[PDB]
Every structure is written in structure tokens, then in C-alpha cells.
Amino acid sequence: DLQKMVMGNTKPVELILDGKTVAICCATGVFGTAYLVPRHLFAEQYDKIMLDGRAMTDSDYRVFEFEIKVKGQDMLSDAALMVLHRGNKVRDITKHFRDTARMKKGTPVVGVVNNADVGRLIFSGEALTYKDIVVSMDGDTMPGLFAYKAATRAGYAGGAVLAKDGADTFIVGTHSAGGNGVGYCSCVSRSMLQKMKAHVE
């Protein structure tokens, strides 16, 4: 049921630069008109942002960035929050996130995707462990992650990853990167979202 709720909140995103689609990804609605989106993408050259078929510009929303502490050093999370000033409301699923959730290595993981490339899709995999950071050969850093074995592709970023903790099923965060049969999602805590939800009111 949670998976269904999440798929219901997942929208396709197409970043356009001069009539050209320079990138695609997913946007996971978490409440009102707030959607978790890939930060590394919402920081490039765009003239139009297509959200579920709706053409927008940077003036139709606000992007909040989460700052997490990794071993005492404050780092920027790849999971950012795009809040549309106006639009159709999405279901509130913030209570499905966690703060002190534990994932048993090897347990079922589910990635929820919805983009212009593969359409509505689900990818399953097995939990590995948490990872403080995953730097790119270029210097880009993604902190507070959770690794898992799975077949992921570019454009999956933004989709939510679900895991299990005993009889509990919850949202770990949003897919950020992957390859070599292994993927990573940026962890998003329940508190992070609650405080952020209260801020936007």
C-alpha cells in the first residue's frame, strides 16, 4: 500500500535548455506542493522545468536544500525540496519517513520511478549499508546515503527508495546515483521533513 501511495506522488521531470531536454529525473511529492528532487540536477542551466507535463520556470517554485552533518562536517544533501507556489496538492506521506530506522543488510528494497524515459517503473534490490559519502571523480559529493544492490539508470534520481525494518515498511529517501549493480539514495529523515513542512506551513 505504501508503494502505491508513493507511486501516486511520483512525477516525471524534464529539464529543458533552449528547446532541448538536457536531463530527466523523478520528483517525489511529500506534501502539499512540495517534491523531493535531485539537487545535483536542480543546479544547472534551465529555461523550462516540466513537472508532470506542466511547463514551469524558476519563478513557479522555491528550492530548499538540506544540510546534514557527516562526521562533524556539514555537507549538502543531494535530496532537495522543490516547493511550488501553486498547484494540485499531493498526498502527505511525511509520516512514512523515519529517524532511527535500521535496515538489515540483505533485506528487500523497492525503488519507485516515473520519468519520460522508462515511464512508471519499480526496481527491487537488496539493502547493503549506510555510506557517509560517495564522491565523484570530478569532486562532487553526496552525503548521508544508503547503498543497495539494484539495476538503476540515469533518470531514476528523485524516485523514492522503500525498505523494511521488521514489520515496518518505510521510505528511506530518494535515489541519487548508481551503477555497477549498486545504487545509492540520499537519506531523508522524518524530522527533516516535519520541520520543513511546518516552515512552509
CATH number of the domain encompassing residue 129: 2.40.10.10
Q: How many domains does the chain have?
A: 2
Sign of the CA dihedral running 122, 124, 127, 133:
negative
Cα atoms found within 13 Å of the Cα of residue 82, Cβ hemisphere only: 29
- Residue in 51, 115, 105 with CA at minimum distance from that of residue 83: 51
Q: What is the resolution of this structure in A?
A: 2.2
Contact yes or no for 128/182 (Cβ under 8 A): yes
Do 49 and 108 lie in a common domain?
no
Pairwise CA distance, residues 16 & 36, whole Å: 19
- Sequence-distant (6+) residues with CB within 8 A of 119 are none
Do 55 and 97 lie in a common domain?
no
Do 98 and 184 lie in a common domain?
yes
Q: What domain range includes position 1?
A: 1-92
Contact yes or no for 162/6 (Cβ under 8 A): yes
- Sequence-distant (6+) residues with CB within 8 A of 129 are 103, 105, 146, 147
Do 103 and 64 lie in a common domain?
no
Pairwise CA distance, residues 95 & 190, whole Å: 7
Do 79 and 103 lie in a common domain?
no
